[PDB]
Enzyme design. Structure first.
Site, PDB file in Angstrom:
ATOM      1  N   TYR A   1      47.763  46.939  56.475  1.00 33.18           N
ATOM      2  CA  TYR A   1      47.547  48.346  56.789  1.00 33.18           C
ATOM      3  C   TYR A   1      46.878  48.548  58.161  1.00 33.18           C
ATOM      4  O   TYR A   1      46.422  47.596  58.807  1.00 33.18           O
ATOM      5  CB  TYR A   1      46.742  48.978  55.643  1.00 33.18           C
ATOM      6  CG  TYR A   1      46.528  50.483  55.731  1.00 33.18           C
ATOM      7  CD1 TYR A   1      47.517  51.368  55.266  1.00 33.18           C
ATOM      8  CD2 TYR A   1      45.340  50.996  56.278  1.00 33.18           C
ATOM      9  CE1 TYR A   1      47.296  52.758  55.309  1.00 33.18           C
ATOM     10  CE2 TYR A   1      45.129  52.385  56.357  1.00 33.18           C
ATOM     11  CZ  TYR A   1      46.095  53.266  55.849  1.00 33.18           C
ATOM     12  OH  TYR A   1      45.856  54.604  55.883  1.00 33.18           O
ATOM     13  N   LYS A   2      46.822  49.805  58.603  1.00 34.40           N
ATOM     14  CA  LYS A   2      46.144  50.298  59.808  1.00 34.40           C
ATOM     15  C   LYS A   2      44.650  49.955  59.835  1.00 34.40           C
ATOM     16  O   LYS A   2      44.063  49.585  58.825  1.00 34.40           O
ATOM     17  CB  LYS A   2      46.370  51.820  59.889  1.00 34.40           C
ATOM     18  CG  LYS A   2      47.853  52.183  60.042  1.00 34.40           C
ATOM     19  CD  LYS A   2      48.106  53.690  60.091  1.00 34.40           C
ATOM     20  CE  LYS A   2      47.965  54.351  58.723  1.00 34.40           C
ATOM     21  NZ  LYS A   2      48.266  55.798  58.791  1.00 34.40           N
ATOM     22  N   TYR A   3      44.010  50.084  60.991  1.00 40.30           N
ATOM     23  CA  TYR A   3      42.645  49.596  61.213  1.00 40.30           C
ATOM     24  C   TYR A   3      41.588  50.261  60.324  1.00 40.30           C
ATOM     25  O   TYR A   3      40.817  49.574  59.662  1.00 40.30           O
ATOM     26  CB  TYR A   3      42.267  49.763  62.693  1.00 40.30           C
ATOM     27  CG  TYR A   3      40.830  49.369  62.981  1.00 40.30           C
ATOM     28  CD1 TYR A   3      40.501  48.010  63.078  1.00 40.30           C
ATOM     29  CD2 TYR A   3      39.822  50.346  63.079  1.00 40.30           C
ATOM     30  CE1 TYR A   3      39.159  47.622  63.234  1.00 40.30           C
ATOM     31  CE2 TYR A   3      38.478  49.961  63.234  1.00 40.30           C
ATOM     32  CZ  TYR A   3      38.144  48.595  63.296  1.00 40.30           C
ATOM     33  OH  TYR A   3      36.855  48.197  63.417  1.00 40.30           O
ATOM     34  N   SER A   4      41.514  51.591  60.331  1.00 39.62           N
ATOM     35  CA  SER A   4      40.326  52.289  59.818  1.00 39.62           C
ATOM     36  C   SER A   4      40.195  52.258  58.293  1.00 39.62           C
ATOM     37  O   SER A   4      39.081  52.314  57.773  1.00 39.62           O
ATOM     38  CB  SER A   4      40.311  53.727  60.324  1.00 39.62           C
ATOM     39  OG  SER A   4      39.141  54.383  59.891  1.00 39.62           O
TER      40      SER A   4
END
EC number: 3.6.4.-
Lengths: 497, 23, 359, 7, 524
Positions: A1-4
């Site tokens: 998944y994406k960073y945040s």
DNA sequence: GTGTAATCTACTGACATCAGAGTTCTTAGA
DNA sequence: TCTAAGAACTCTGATGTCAGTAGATTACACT
């Protein structure tokens, strides 16, 4: 998944008497097992990822706490960032007296319904505002048929858990040594994604393992200027970076509140709260004083803009491994800029490995930093361990010293040993052969520091004092090696020491 | 997929149990 | 919003809004609470300017409390340092007698910071902070005048920093800096007027160019600055010789060439009507027999300020008052000529008073 | 190794 | 060392006149001594300098005479250098209309060294003669001078306007007389005390390398509980930082103590100011909450090393230790203790027994008490004059980051086509620095980056120079020879241009943005 | 004018990092 | 007969970085 996106994780225990107060042995207890698990993954997540979310819930208890769909469920803890007071709430319910402490409060063995329990947890994850990368539920029940006696009760659960999986919340399970048997193929076969004693997975939740875990992120992005014109965007990533005990936050004694360090500059003669423009910077040389502004002590030390200029190519043997500057950083392509530049980089990677070659570059990580010189050594991936990528493919930035760095070291000359003095050594060395692996050691200080910090934080009776792995285990070095230190003491030097 | 990825801390690679010198 | 809805209506309770703002600003660390606490002070001070209550506000405390913060301006977040300068320069606007010795050290502070912020080599400018200076300075100059008769060096320095803010020397992709430089130039062209006749074409070129930019508050700030520029330039030859026929020729040409033709907003066009009104007191000095013809041409232009060709809901809201706000100056000092313009004033009377409910 | 001017 | 230097400079008329393709021998020598003086003007060496001028139309010396000891000025006495000397060298000095003798100036200068070397301390000494060979002389004191240069222990360096691979018969015969003098001093090494103004301006181009030692550290290398060997390591690479920090000074007084730096404290309950000596206690952070330690209870519980240790943990192949992972602040060179001949045989045995197995050591280290314990790889290597075994730090399990970068051999969406590959095939041979002009199997080493001085310090001293000699003026550009050194240009760029020209077409080059500077509001 | 887009530029959490300052040890040392 | 100059290490504080969030500016547009 994406960073945040946070990891977010909810723990959901069967409060039913038939497991809760139950043992075949005396030596464990399934509730005392689950609560230990919840306290122990939670103390892992506190040191390692304070950013990621935990909750814990009891189902089938007799006194309730829920938003809605109330019957016989108690959310002990809603979703929150983890800390001490939550670990103190779980601690209260642990042990032989603990299994009575819980009974004075929420009450035990009543009827329950998984299709309502899965509803409750769903509402929980909904209620939180943060972006979540992994959404996971953990089942601590032994009740292998979850009282699906009414198949038209049970089809609600199975459909509702279809709806959990359909909404991209995941769910996960552990079986807990039910007397005589447990078999997933009866039921839970379709709730999870031949017969068991107790899960081989569950011991992994008792690893108590500690580090920061910090996800894949760039250090910076740069343009590899091949000349005045051709550029590719590359990333710059930190594969090896020494960890530190976290920065300490200064506190007021009388209330434990945080306090601001609030510094100013003040004129030694007079009330002037001197502004940054009021004062310059300076040196002393040759009994005279040199004066420069707070702009120009950092106009000096400029040369270039952020990039990587190509400087031509070398043999990999001439890059001598004795002179080493600072930890090596990875280079990997980034289509975020300079689209299709990955096509050039990939050919450059492939063909350098044939040439037995490095690229030399000059490197500035920022504006207002001097260029260092860096060899781009090319890299190749050992996927042979069933695609556990021990090594990513790309380039290493290996830094090179300049004249000033290579410090003078005193005079000495000798070529002293005989072939017998090497010959005895060639034995001891081959007796002391092991296998180093990069992960085989841990920092004695930083590991000890967390154990001290827990004793203070969860109010524990003792610091755990877990002894380090860097000391040589000298009795094994006595025995494996054996008596052969005497070959030096006899064959190589006199008896005077 | 499952084989290398820790259940305590997902996506990140499983921390192996410290080791040290042993012959 | 509620202070703006209600206005000045009932003043005798208002100090407790001030006490809430300075208490919030000091006790809350978050810039997003410091910003509304500053914002509510700006409007509170601005609306009670003429009030009974402006002494019991302790306006002389309020300078010393917020001036002291410049002692550590490097630690203050960029957007909070806008509002400290917006505030500080406004203290010089609303109650000058309590600022009387302070405002000179504040001129040294505003110029020293803005020189440093515009001319530094080591960094690109902190656009919010630069804007905060030009905004606060625009209130500061309303009292404590740095008009070129006295203090010629500081008044030149303020003017050529206004040229540095106003010139699109390269284009910004956000315009808070020009937007603030324009309001400063509009209220204080009176301060810098010899420079208005030095730099005169580059000033009217750049000012006219801002009028084309489609951003709306930029456009309103642009346009309101040309009116005042021509206002000051008129006073510069209300009491000067024949030397300026060359300059008057450029103005009486160019903005007339716009008025008589342009397909543009009521702001660009009604200014150029404001323009033509002003130059009567200049132009009488070379010839009385051009003073009547500019009145003849104002009313014989009114027939085409009418004739917008179906320009619904925009034109009357600013068009015709400009016809009347440009026609007293052509007679105020004269006594020579007889007038059809008086009966035809029925045309303007009925038009103008009929449109009172229409705005 | 060098000295003097080459210090 | 504390040195003596004596610049002995010919300022007669004739060196003003030249071969027209160069600066005059006078100003050439003046430039050499300028490019020299700058060096110790910055470098914190303990070295005294003197100036002697000869061919002077006046005379000033302790030894004055009518024919000898004449047309000489002892212009500056033997003391540490300073900026006023550098200004006088750069701008004051004049040619005389007369002429003089270098043997003359040498005897005066050498007698001044015999005065100065008594009343204050020295170790090594030099005298330095600069001339066009317009000196006319009798070959007088020479055997006593060469004998006395041994008895005074002073070496002579000699500096000239022409090559040693249009000059006057007087310059040819003068050089054979200088050769004869240095053959008499030192024999075959003696001519290497002779330098041209040409090669020296082509060598004095830069400021000095920063001079620093690695400090001594005594210890005991310990392969097992009973067997210890004496070891004393030295740092070898260190990423080097400038000696003197930028001092802080008041803008109008220019005094370095008119500022006091109050680190005051605030509780946020309307500026209650704390006292650090009573009321401030450090905390760490533990999840969603803070926990108070005491600085004085961390020391009660802190991991304390039992000694200032060095001790081997075991050994394993070069394969166990890949390139990337090396993790250190510094490199040690880890040597047998001074005058321990038992350690010398034992450690030479140790590392000679690692030279052949490809085995490496793994070692617990600690510099001193209280400092952190340490691990890693003690990696051997060999040079004809000594065995190498460097020590370098390696990561603990939490210093190492593991990420699955999306792996690039899955090339179906990022195609490396035949024509792209067939362009690159020529790039990486074409832009080679290392050329095969050899039979040693060592390539030319055309760009020896580890021999280059750090451009950060060259740039710093270059500014301190300019602002010293021009004390109110603006800063200069980068001096051009620094780019010419820091580039990699010459023949390699003449080779590159065509293989690069086919990259421009066979590969795409889609956009990137640009950002601005003071150019965002600067003239023209 | 009035109203609705699209989109630049900010601020924050978090992570690395140079510098700068506090701290213990060698040589040269009256 | 000992007193600073020179090391060495850790720690603290600022500056710059990246990713992601969301506000206000500002463009586009109405017959």
């Amino acid at each position: 998944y994406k960073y945040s996106g946070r990891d977010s994780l909810i723990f959901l225990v069967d409060a039913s008497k038939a497991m809760f107060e139950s043992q075949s042995e005396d030596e464990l207890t399934p509730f005392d097992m689950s609560i230990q698990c919840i306290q122990s993954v939670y103390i892992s997540k506190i040191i390692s990822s304070d950013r990621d979310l935990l909750a814990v819930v009891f189902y089938g208890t007799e006194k309730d706490k829920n938003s809605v769909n109330f019957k016989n469920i108690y959310v002990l803890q809603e979703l929150d960032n983890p800390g001490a007071k939550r670990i103190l709430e779980l601690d209260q319910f642990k042990g032989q007296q603990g299994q009575k402490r819980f009974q004075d409060m929420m009450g035990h063995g009543s009827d329950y319904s998984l299709s309502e329990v899965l509803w409750v947890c769903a509402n929980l994850f909904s209620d939180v505002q943060f972006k979540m990368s992994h959404k996971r539920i953990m089942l601590f029940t032994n009740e292998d048929n979850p009282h699906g006696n009414d198949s038209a009760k049970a089809s609600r659960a199975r459909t509702k858990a279809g709806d959990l999986r359909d909404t991209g919340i995941f769910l996960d399970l552990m079986h807990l040594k039910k007397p005589g048997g447990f078999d997933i193929s009866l039921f839970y076969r379709d709730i999870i994604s031949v017969h068991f004693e107790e899960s081989s997975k569950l011991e992994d939740l008792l690893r108590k393992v500690r580090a920061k875990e910090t996800r894949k992120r760039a250090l910076s992005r740069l343009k590899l200027k091949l000349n005045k014109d051709i550029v590719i965007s590359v990333g710059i990533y930190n594969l090896v970076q020494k960890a530190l005990k976290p920065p300490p936050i200064k506190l007021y004694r009388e209330t434990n509140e945080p306090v601001k360090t609030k510094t100013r500059t003040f004129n030694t003669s007079t009330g002037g709260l001197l502004l940054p423009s009021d004062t310059k910077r300076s040196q002393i040389y040759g009994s005279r004083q040199i004066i420069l502004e707070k702009e120009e002590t950092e106009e000096l030390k400029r040369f270039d803009d952020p990039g990587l200029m190509l400087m031509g190519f070398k043999p990999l043997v001439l890059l001598k491994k004795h002179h080493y500057l600072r930890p090596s950083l990875f280079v990997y392509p980034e289509e975020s800029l300079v689209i299709g530049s990955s096509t050039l980089f990939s050919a450059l990677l492939i063909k350098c490995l044939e040439k037995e070659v490095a690229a030399l570059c000059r490197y500035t990580p920022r504006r207002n930093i001097p260029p260092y010189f860096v060899a781009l050594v090319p890299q190749e991936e050992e996927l042979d361990d069933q695609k556990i990528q021990v090594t990513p493919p790309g380039f290493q930035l290996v830094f090179l010293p300049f004249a000033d760095d290579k410090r003078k070291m005193p005079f000495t000359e000798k070529i002293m040993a005989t072939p017998e003095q090497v010959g005895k050594m060639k034995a001891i060395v081959e007796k002391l052969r092991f296998t180093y692996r990069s992960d085989s050691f841990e920092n004695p200080v930083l590991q000890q520091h967390f154990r001290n910090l827990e004793a203070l934080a969860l109010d524990l009776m003792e610091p755990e004092q877990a002894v380090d792995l860097t000391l040589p285990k000298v009795e094994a070095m006595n025995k494996r090696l054996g008596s052969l230190v005497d070959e030096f003491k006899e064959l190589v030097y006199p008896p005077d020491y | 997929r499952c084989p290398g990825e820790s259940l305590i801390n997902p996506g990140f690679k499983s921390k192996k149990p410290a080791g040290g010198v042993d012959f | 919003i509620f202070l703006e809805k209600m206005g000045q209506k009932i003043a005798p309770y208002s100090v407790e809004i001030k006490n809430t703002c300075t208490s919030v600003y000091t006790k809350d660390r978050a810039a997003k609470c410091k910003i509304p606490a500053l914002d509510l002070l700006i409007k509170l001070l601005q609306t009670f300017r003429s009030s009974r209550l402006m002494d019991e506000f302790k306006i002389g405390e309020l300078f010393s409390k917020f001036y002291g913060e410049l002692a550590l301006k490097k630690k203050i977040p960029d957007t909070v340092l806008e509002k400290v300068y917006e505030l500080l320069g406004l203290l010089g606007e609303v109650h000058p007698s309590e600022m009387i010795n302070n405002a000179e050290n504040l001129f040294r502070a505003f110029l020293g910071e803005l020189k440093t912020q515009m001319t530094s080599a080591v960094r690109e400018p902190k656009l919010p902070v630069l804007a905060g200076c030009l905004k606060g300075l625009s209130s500061l100059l309303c009292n404590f005048t740095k008009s070129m008769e006295e203090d010629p060096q500081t008044s030149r320095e303020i003017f050529n920093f206004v040229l540095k803010a106003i010139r699109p020397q390269i284009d910004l992709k956000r315009y808070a800096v020009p937007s603030a430089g324009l309001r400063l130039f509009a209220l204080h062209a009176s301060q810098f007027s010899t420079c208005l006749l030095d730099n005169y074409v580059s000033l009217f070129e750049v000012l006219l160019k801002w009028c084309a930019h489609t951003n709306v508050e930029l456009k309103k700030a642009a346009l309101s600055a040309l009116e005042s520029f021509l206002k000051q330039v008129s006073n510069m030859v209300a009491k000067n010789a024949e030397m300026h026929k060359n300059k008057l020729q450029y103005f009486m040409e160019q903005f007339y060439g716009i008025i008589r033709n342009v397909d543009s907003n009521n702001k660009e066009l009604s200014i150029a009507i404001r323009g033509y009104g002003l130059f009567a007191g200049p132009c009488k000095v070379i010839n009385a027999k051009d003073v009547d013809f500019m009145y003849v041409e104002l009313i014989q232009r009114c027939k085409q300020m009418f004739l917008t060709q179906t320009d619904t809901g925009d034109d009357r809201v600013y068009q015709m008052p400009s016809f009347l706000q440009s026609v007293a100056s052509v007679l105020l000092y004269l006594d020579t000529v007889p007038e059809v313009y008086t009966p035809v004033l029925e045309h303007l009377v009925v038009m103008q008073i009929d449109s009172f409910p229409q705005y | 190794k060098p000295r003097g001017l080459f210090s | 060392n504390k040195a003596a230097v004596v610049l002995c400079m010919d300022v007669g008329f004739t060196m003003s006149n030249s071969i027209p393709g160069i600066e005059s021998p006078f100003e050439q020598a003046k430039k050499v001594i300028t490019m020299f003086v700058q060096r110790q003007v910055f470098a914190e060496n303990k070295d005294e300098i003197a100036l002697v001028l000869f061919g002077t139309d006046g005379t000033d010396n302790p030894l004055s005479g009518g024919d000898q000891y004449q047309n000489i000025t002892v212009h500056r006495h033997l003391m540490l250098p300073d900026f006023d000397l550098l200004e006088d060298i750069e701008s004051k000095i004049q040619p005389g209309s007369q002429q003089a003798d270098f043997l003359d100036a040498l005897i005066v200068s050498m007698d001044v060294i015999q005065h100065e070397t008594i009343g204050k301390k020295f170790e090594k000494r030099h005298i330095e003669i600069f001339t066009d060979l317009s000196s006319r002389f009798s070959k007088s004191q020479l055997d006593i001078i060469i004998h006395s240069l041994k008895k005074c222990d002073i070496s002579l360096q000699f500096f000239l306007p022409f090559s040693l691979g249009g000059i006057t018969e007087q310059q040819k015969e003068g050089l054979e007389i200088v050769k004869m003098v240095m053959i008499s001093l030192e024999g075959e090494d003696g001519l290497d005390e002779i330098y041209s103004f040409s090669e020296s301006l082509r060598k004095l181009c830069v400021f000095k390398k920063i001079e620093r030692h690695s400090i001594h550290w005594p210890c005991r290398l310990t392969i097992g509980s009973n067997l210890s060997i004496r070891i004393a390591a030295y740092k070898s690479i260190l990423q080097e930082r400038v000696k003197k920090t930028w001092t802080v000074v008041d803008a109008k007084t220019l005094k370095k103590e008119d500022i006091q730096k109050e680190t005051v404290y605030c509780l946020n309950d309307d500026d209650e100011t704390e006292v650090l000596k009573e009321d401030i206690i450090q905390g760490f952070r533990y999840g969603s909450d803070i926990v108070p330690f005491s600085k004085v209870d961390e020391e009660q519980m802190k991991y304390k090393s039992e000694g200032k240790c060095f001790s081997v943990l075991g050994f394993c192949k070069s394969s166990q230790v890949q390139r990337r992972f090396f993790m250190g602040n510094q490199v040690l060179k880890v040597f047998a203790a001074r005058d321990d001949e038992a350690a010398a045989v034992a450690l030479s045995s140790l590392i000679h027994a690692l030279d052949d197995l490809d085995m490496v050591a793994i070692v617990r280290y600690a510099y001193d008490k209280r400092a952190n314990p340490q691990v890693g790889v003690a990696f051997p290597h060999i040079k004809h004059n000594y065995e190498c075994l460097v020590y370098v730090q390696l990561p603990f399990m939490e210093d190492l980051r593991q990420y699955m970068f999306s792996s690039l051999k899955n090339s179906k969406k990022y195609a490396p086509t035949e024509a792209q590959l067939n362009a690159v095939d020529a790039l990486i041979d074409s832009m080679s620095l290392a050329k095969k002009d050899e039979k040693t199997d060592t390539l030319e080493d055309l760009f020896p980056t580890t021999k280059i001085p750090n451009p950060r310090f060259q740039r710093l001293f270059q500014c301190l120079l300019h602002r010293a000699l021009h004390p109110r003026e603006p800063l200069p550009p980068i001096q051009q020879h620094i780019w010419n050194m820091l580039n990699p240009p010459a023949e390699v760029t003449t080779k590159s241009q065509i293989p690069l020209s086919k990259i421009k077409t066979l590969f795409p080059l889609i956009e990137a943005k640009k950002k601005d500077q003071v150019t965002a509001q600067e003239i023209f």
